Amino acid sequence: FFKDGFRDNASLELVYRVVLKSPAVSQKLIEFYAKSLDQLSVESLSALKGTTVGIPLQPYLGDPHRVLLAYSLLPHTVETEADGNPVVETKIGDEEQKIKIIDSEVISFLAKEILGKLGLETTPQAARQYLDSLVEGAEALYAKIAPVEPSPLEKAIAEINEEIKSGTPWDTLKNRADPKELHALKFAQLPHPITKKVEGKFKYF
Amino acid sequence: ALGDSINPNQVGVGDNVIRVNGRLFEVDKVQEKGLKTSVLDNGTKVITLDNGGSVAQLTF
Amino acid sequence: MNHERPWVFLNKVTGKWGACGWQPFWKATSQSLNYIPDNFIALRTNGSWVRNLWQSSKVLDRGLNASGYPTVGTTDWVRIPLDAPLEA
Amino acid sequence: STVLSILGKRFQRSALTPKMNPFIRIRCQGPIEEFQRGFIGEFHAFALPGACMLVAS
Amino acid sequence: LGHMRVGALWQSNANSRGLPNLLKEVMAAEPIYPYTHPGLSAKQILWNTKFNLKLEKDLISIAESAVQSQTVNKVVIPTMLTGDVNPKSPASVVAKDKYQLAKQMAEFQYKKSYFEKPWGYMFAYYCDEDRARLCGGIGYVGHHGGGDAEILSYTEYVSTVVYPTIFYMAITFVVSLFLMYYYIYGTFFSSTRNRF
Amino acid sequence: MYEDEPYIGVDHLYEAHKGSKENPVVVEAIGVHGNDVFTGCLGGCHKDAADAVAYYTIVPPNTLAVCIDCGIHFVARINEQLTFWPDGTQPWEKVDFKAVEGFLYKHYKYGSPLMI
Amino acid sequence: MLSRLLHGPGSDKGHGYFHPDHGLVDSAAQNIRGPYWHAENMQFMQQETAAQSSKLPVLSAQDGKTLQKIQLTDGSKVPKAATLVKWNPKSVHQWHSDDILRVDMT
Amino acid sequence: SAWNFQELMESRIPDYKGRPNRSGAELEQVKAALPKIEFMTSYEFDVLTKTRSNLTKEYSYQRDMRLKVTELMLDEAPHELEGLAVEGDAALKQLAELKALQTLTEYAGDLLEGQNQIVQRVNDFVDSNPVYLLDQPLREEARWNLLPEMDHKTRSLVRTELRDWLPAEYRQTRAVDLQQVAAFSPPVKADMFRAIEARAKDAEAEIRSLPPAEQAGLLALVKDNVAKSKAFIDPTYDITPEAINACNDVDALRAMAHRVTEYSGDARLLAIYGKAAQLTGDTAAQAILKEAKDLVF
Amino acid sequence: GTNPGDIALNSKRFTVGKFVAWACGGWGLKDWIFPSLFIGRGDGPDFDRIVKHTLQSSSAIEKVNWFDSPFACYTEWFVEHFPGFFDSRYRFEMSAKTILANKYPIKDFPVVDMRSWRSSRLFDLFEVPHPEHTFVFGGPVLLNTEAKRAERLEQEWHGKDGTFVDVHPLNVATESHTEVSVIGGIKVYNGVWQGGKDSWKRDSAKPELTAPFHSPIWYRNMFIVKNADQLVEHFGENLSDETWQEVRKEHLAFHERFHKDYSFA
Ligand SMILES: CCCCCCCC/C=C\CCCCCCCC(=O)OC[C@H](O)COP(=O)(O)OC[C@H](N)C(=O)O
Ligand SMILES: [Zn+2]
Numbered sequence A: 001f002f003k004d005g006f007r008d009n010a011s012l013e014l015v016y017r018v019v020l021k022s023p024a025v026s027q028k029l030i031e032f033y034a035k036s037l038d039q040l041s042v043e044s045l046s047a048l049k050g051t052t053v054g055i056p057l058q059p060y061l062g063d064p065h066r067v068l069l070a071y072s073l074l075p076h077t078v079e080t081e082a083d084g085n086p087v088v089e090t091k092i093g094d095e096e097q098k099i100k101i102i103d104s105e106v107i108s109f110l111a112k113e114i115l116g117k118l119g120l121e122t123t124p125q126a127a128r129q130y131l132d133s134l135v136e137g138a139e140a141l142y143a144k145i146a147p148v149e150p151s152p153l154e155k156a157i158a159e160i161n162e163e164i165k166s167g168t169p170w171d172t173l174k175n176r177a178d179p180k181e182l183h184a185l186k187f188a189q190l191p192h193p194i195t196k197k198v199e200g201k202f203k204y205f
Numbered sequence B: 001a002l003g004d005s006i007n008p009n010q011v012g013v014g015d016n017v018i019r020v021n022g023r024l025f026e027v028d029k030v031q032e033k034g035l036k037t038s039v040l041d042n043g044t045k046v047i048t049l050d051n052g053g054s055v056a057q058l059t060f
Numbered sequence C: 001m002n003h004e005r006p007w008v009f010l011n012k013v014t015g016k017w018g019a020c021g022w023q024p025f026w027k028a029t030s031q032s033l034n035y036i037p038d039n040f041i042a043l044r045t046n047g048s049w050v051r052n053l054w055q056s057s058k059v060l061d062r063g064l065n066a067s068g069y070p071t072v073g074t075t076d077w078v079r080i081p082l083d084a085p086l087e088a
Numbered sequence D: 001s002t003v004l005s006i007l008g009k010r011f012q013r014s015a016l017t018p019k020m021n022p023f024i025r026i027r028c029q030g031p032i033e034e035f036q037r038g039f040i041g042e043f044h045a046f047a048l049p050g051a052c053m054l055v056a057s
Numbered sequence E: 001l002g003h004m005r006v007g008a009l010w011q012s013n014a015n016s017r018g019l020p021n022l023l024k025e026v027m028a029a030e031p032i033y034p035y036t037h038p039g040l041s042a043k044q045i046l047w048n049t050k051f052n053l054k055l056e057k058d059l060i061s062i063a064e065s066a067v068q069s070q071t072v073n074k075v076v077i078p079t080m081l082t083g084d085v086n087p088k089s090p091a092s093v094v095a096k097d098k099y100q101l102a103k104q105m106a107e108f109q110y111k112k113s114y115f116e117k118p119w120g121y122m123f124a125y126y127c128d129e130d131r132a133r134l135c136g137g138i139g140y141v142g143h144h145g146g147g148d149a150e151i152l153s154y155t156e157y158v159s160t161v162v163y164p165t166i167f168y169m170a171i172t173f174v175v176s177l178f179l180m181y182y183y184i185y186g187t188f189f190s191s192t193r194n195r196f
Numbered sequence F: 001m002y003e004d005e006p007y008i009g010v011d012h013l014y015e016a017h018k019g020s021k022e023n024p025v026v027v028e029a030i031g032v033h034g035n036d037v038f039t040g041c042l043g044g045c046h047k048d049a050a051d052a053v054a055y056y057t058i059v060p061p062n063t064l065a066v067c068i069d070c071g072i073h074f075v076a077r078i079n080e081q082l083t084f085w086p087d088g089t090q091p092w093e094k095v096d097f098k099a100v101e102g103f104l105y106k107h108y109k110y111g112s113p114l115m116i
Numbered sequence G: 001m002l003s004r005l006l007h008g009p010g011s012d013k014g015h016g017y018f019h020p021d022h023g024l025v026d027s028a029a030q031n032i033r034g035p036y037w038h039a040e041n042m043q044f045m046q047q048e049t050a051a052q053s054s055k056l057p058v059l060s061a062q063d064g065k066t067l068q069k070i071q072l073t074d075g076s077k078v079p080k081a082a083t084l085v086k087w088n089p090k091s092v093h094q095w096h097s098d099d100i101l102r103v104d105m106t
Numbered sequence H: 001s002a003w004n005f006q007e008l009m010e011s012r013i014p015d016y017k018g019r020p021n022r023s024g025a026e027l028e029q030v031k032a033a034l035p036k037i038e039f040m041t042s043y044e045f046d047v048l049t050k051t052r053s054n055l056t057k058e059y060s061y062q063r064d065m066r067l068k069v070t071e072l073m074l075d076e077a078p079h080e081l082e083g084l085a086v087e088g089d090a091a092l093k094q095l096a097e098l099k100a101l102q103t104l105t106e107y108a109g110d111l112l113e114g115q116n117q118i119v120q121r122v123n124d125f126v127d128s129n130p131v132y133l134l135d136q137p138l139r140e141e142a143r144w145n146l147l148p149e150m151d152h153k154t155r156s157l158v159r160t161e162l163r164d165w166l167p168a169e170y171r172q173t174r175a176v177d178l179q180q181v182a183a184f185s186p187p188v189k190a191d192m193f194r195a196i197e198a199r200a201k202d203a204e205a206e207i208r209s210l211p212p213a214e215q216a217g218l219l220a221l222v223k224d225n226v227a228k229s230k231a232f233i234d235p236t237y238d239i240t241p242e243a244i245n246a247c248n249d250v251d252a253l254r255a256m257a258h259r260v261t262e263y264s265g266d267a268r269l270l271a272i273y274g275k276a277a278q279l280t281g282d283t284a285a286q287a288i289l290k291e292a293k294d295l296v297f
Numbered sequence I: 001g002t003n004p005g006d007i008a009l010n011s012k013r014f015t016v017g018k019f020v021a022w023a024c025g026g027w028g029l030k031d032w033i034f035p036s037l038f039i040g041r042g043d044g045p046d047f048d049r050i051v052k053h054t055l056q057s058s059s060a061i062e063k064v065n066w067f068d069s070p071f072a073c074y075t076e077w078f079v080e081h082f083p084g085f086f087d088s089r090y091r092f093e094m095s096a097k098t099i100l101a102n103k104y105p106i107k108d109f110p111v112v113d114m115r116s117w118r119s120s121r122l123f124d125l126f127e128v129p130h131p132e133h134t135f136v137f138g139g140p141v142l143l144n145t146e147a148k149r150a151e152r153l154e155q156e157w158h159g160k161d162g163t164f165v166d167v168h169p170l171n172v173a174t175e176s177h178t179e180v181s182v183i184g185g186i187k188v189y190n191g192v193w194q195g196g197k198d199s200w201k202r203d204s205a206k207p208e209l210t211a212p213f214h215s216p217i218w219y220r221n222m223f224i225v226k227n228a229d230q231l232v233e234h235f236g237e238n239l240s241d242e243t244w245q246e247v248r249k250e251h252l253a254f255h256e257r258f259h260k261d262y263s264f265a
Helices: A009-020 A023-034 A039-046 A064-076 A104-117 A124-134 A138-143 A152-166 A179-189 C049-062 D003-007 D031-038 D047-056 E022-026 E042-068 E098-134 E154-185 F097-110 G027-033 G064-068 H024-033 H042-049 H060-080 H090-128 H138-144 H152-164 H178-183 H186-208 H212-233 H241-246 H250-263 H268-280 H283-295 I016-024 I029-033 I047-055 I070-081 I085-100 I151-157 I241-254
Strands: A052-056 A077-080 A086-091 A096-100 B017-020 B023-026 B034-039 B045-050 C007-011 C016-020 C077-081 E074-076 F025-029 F037-041 F055-059 F065-067 F072-078 G043-046 G083-086 H036-040 I106-111 I180-183 I186-189 I205-207 I218-225
Touching: A009 A023, A009 A064, A009 A104, A009 H042, A009 H250, A009 H268, A009 H283, A023 A104, A023 H024, A023 H036, A039 H024, A052 H042, A064 A077, A064 A086, A064 A104, A064 A124, A104 A124, A124 D003, A138 E098, A152 E098, A152 I085, A179 C007, A179 C016, A179 I047, B017 H090, C007 C049, C016 C049, C016 I047, C049 I047, C049 I070, E022 I085, E022 I106, E042 H060, E042 H090, E042 H178, E042 H186, E042 H212, E042 I180, E098 I070, E098 I085, E098 I106, E098 I241, F025 F037, F037 F072, F055 F065, F055 F072, F055 I218, F097 H090, H036 H042, H042 I186, H060 H090, H090 I205, H138 H152, H178 H186, H178 H212, H186 H212, H241 H250, H241 H268, H250 H268, H268 H283, I047 I070, I070 I085, I085 I106
Parallel strands: A052 E074, A052 H036, E074 I186, F025 F072, F065 I218, I106 I218
Antiparallel strands: A077 A086, A086 A096, B017 B023, B034 B045, C007 C016, C007 C077, F037 F055, F065 F072, G043 G083, I180 I186, I205 I218
């Protein structure tokens, strides 16, 4: 909408909201649902004929980004299961991940329509290019973030580190006597806490 | 403090204790003063004068 | 067991100080798993004497007039209790 | 700065999403099946000790 | 009978020790409201609590009246697979465009300054405190480990420690075989010497 | 055979895994109220966590715990198995909250015997 | 078969354990939902209630309506006026019906 | 047959089958039987069902208990704060009163936790003995099956019946989200704002009937409370059509569109995006906006 | 450690206890004649070490609330046996305070105690001596019981088809939901009341009753469990790995003056 090729997730979401309600996509999804619905679900929906029913699609079909990602991953197929669903193998994290694209025909239809609305080519490579353009340019936006104020923990750490530069008492105290002399004086001058009398020195028994 | 086989010395300060600038302060309440006199319905007269001291004296 | 709480010896002639106290000991053997030793130097206390000694160190080392405290025997040493922080 | 790299941030060693290993259900398991799952099915550790048992018998 | 307990309220025993209250352990004998309600005295806190409580009552009443007396124009029934208790969450936790990336970066910076470094330092203290608890002859602290330990991955260890060790063992095996045969028999391939 | 099975859809790239700070792994044991719960992993919820044998855990009930081996948040919690005294006097038809109210009040205030 | 000898699934590892044809039956199912392996050749009988036993020490713990809903029979000879209700397998609720005749095993 | 090593119940292995195989005639019969369906994006469902105000997803009775306990605690605060004596200046007295208040609130927080635990225990009992709280035919379907293993209809019926067996003050139903109901009903937000202003005025009068310093402190508190209450009910209440028309910055309009999209995604998006398209000359965007206002909104 | 009990009655040279120990075990003439070798320093608090560790501390010793906590009775043990105790404790308390002063509505506090350690053997999780009766109410519960089972392998073991394990009929019905709401004239069906596992969020936190409704404050104590044989921690969303490595470096750099003057021999 801002003359940037709909390079915004909010714009893409509004575009998809428009798409799903158009007659052609509505007809395609009606066929898909009617051929793959529980009997109980049919009985339930038929009972709401008077009112309007809004059925949110499952996330893998109702999320434009997921639809485009699956469509653009389809070219990387490595096999096909016993139910026709393609199995793709790609490199996402640190290991080769295999993903089974369920309902790839519906995914491809929705992706082609999304790409048609955005004024881009309806080919899986175009979907990858668009998704990579969505997320590109983030460094400039990072650079303009103003830093937050230091936390109370940060302030305490800074204060303590500045303080210990001066030195702790164990390093800055001068007129401190040797502990051995103090203990000897204690024994030789103060009453023992057992015999209740002044002992000359340290006695084991 | 409270528990089974827990050290009874493992108890903090009371609820009416505060720490301001490192020093510890105890918070308490007040009490009523003055000379009070009553008479029981059987005839006995009771006279009390509380000064707030620890040591008390009772006389018949 | 009950002995004196830790004190501070101070030498008036040389102005030389140092903490001191009674530290019990016993023949070493197996310890106990379910027991953290209590305060055996300053019994029945929350161990504030370390804080009081830390706060009083600056005053003692700077120089203190020890005429207001009892002497130890007939020597030039005086005992300063650590029941409360020292400010002078 | 590609989409996958972003989607790959939660699948690197540092921030890998945890995943718990699953169980299964066996409708009926007698001792024989237990063997088939306990000793057989580990035929890199059970190979030669089992061979020694069989040779002795 | 001794001292029979009265009632069955919770007591800290071997089977149960309860959930510690770290806030009270840390903020012992120190108020919390100077941090949660900075600048307010007790009377101001109570007055504010009363005002906000009445306001919340009014808002709750308005909201309940609204939700309970509104006409239904549409019915929203999410799609789920059969046998599934709840529908999958439609919210994703991964940033998709660059603006979301900048938003999450600012949030991460704040959280790092104010929620993660505190966790790190608390955990470091906990580890050192466990060491201190087990120290002093009570447990086996200092018997192994430390910061000087040489930790190697599986590949590094097997490549640089295991294989050379087995190589040395094999060479020792062959050399000892030959030397022992010579020592006992006095020859290398002829059994006893001066006999055959 | 399991380690080379494929993911089902691209949801795992977007959703919040099972064991997040907002979607924890909630588990339920039986016992006495307030008693610590015994729970555990089978190992290897993470690449860097051990997997040779099951690893057990003792955790307070009804609290959010985090395993910092794997990074998983869990909610072990206790449900007490309070049931009618089985001596043949159990009720054969729907029962109401009054008698149950009395029994539950007595159990909370004083406790009840164990079926051992 | 070793597996079947040692009480396992047998040749087919996806197979069940119970073989009611030779006496290996399911006691739990029998106690809870009755012996549904005799369902083809047995039928419930449908039409003296149990209220007469409402005052006994152990049955007094039940409500009056509960005992009224239960209908009894001598348990020896077929009541000639009682209809027959087909026993439906895969139905866990027919063993608990109050419309079928029962016998006072107290 | 002479042995029997059975268990209480054999484990159950699911049978998967697959999606139904509906023929052309069946397909047409199904399609002719459906209502006027509007397929919704996952974003729409997310914003409808997002957690906004009820952060902890607490039921109704828990919120009621918390408010009741707050009332009881406030009714007892002056007695606990009365007559406190401590050696020190005014600040020390203030800190002593703060500590007394904290002790009072910590005391009241434990009673609330105990009551929450007791009600949770009652509900735990309800789950532990389901067959003793149900009628036929749901009793056997609760006896033989666990919650994940039930049919959807039987599951719903069983759960509703078990919930309704309890007294009204123990039933576990989520509390209303004030922000949610305000975001999806323009009149409700207006009513909430009117209530906030009425309470602010009444509190201002009450304050003005009080001595001077308390007046200033409490008036500052009232201003803060009104501001934050408004930001709580509707964070985007300042994005008015007047403000949109007054905004000629592309970045500012994008920020407004993001903030509205986070909140509710309503026709204010049409306004913001229309004004952005005009300032940038996006005819494709204008066509899409026409389609949206025809269908989406 | 050890509690000596009555020091007075055990200091006497000749005692019934010493003679019994001589007869049966624990004492002998080697102690009467050579106490300096077989008694020596003995076992007890080290006053000199406590003083050194106290005077090495920074002003953190003044600003810590330790002396009012229930663990204040262990001050000497931790001052002696935990070098740099007061600075670490001050950092711990300031971390808690800064979490408390956050802008988030829920303040999570990490809790670590004797129960925070996992083990592969069950007898290591009990207090010693072990209770008379253990695992009365059943054994452990594995978190893995809440993960999806290996459906493919499970079907394959039984010789079932399992072709369409990933293809399920869609379900869109009002009969499948018990949680119904009305949101601006829209009747939303979403979710089923499950029971005790739907109320984990509220039962885990405790509110601040004085906090207003528009600025809630909740306190949550997050328990932490670790193996202690892993050497690598993965906190998840609570602490990123890079931040944790930074904290490790800073902690090892600051707590070095307290550790450098001692040898481990
Ligand atoms: C693989 C796992 C470990 C294997 C064990 C290796 C360990 C080393 C230990 C032992 C080595 C292997 C153990 C197995 C032992 C093999 C020895 C053995 O049966 O002879 C067979 C016997 O001579 C053959 O006699 P046969 O009957 O043909 O003729 C006779 C007569 N004329 C007759 O009328 O027929
Ligand atoms: Zn794990």
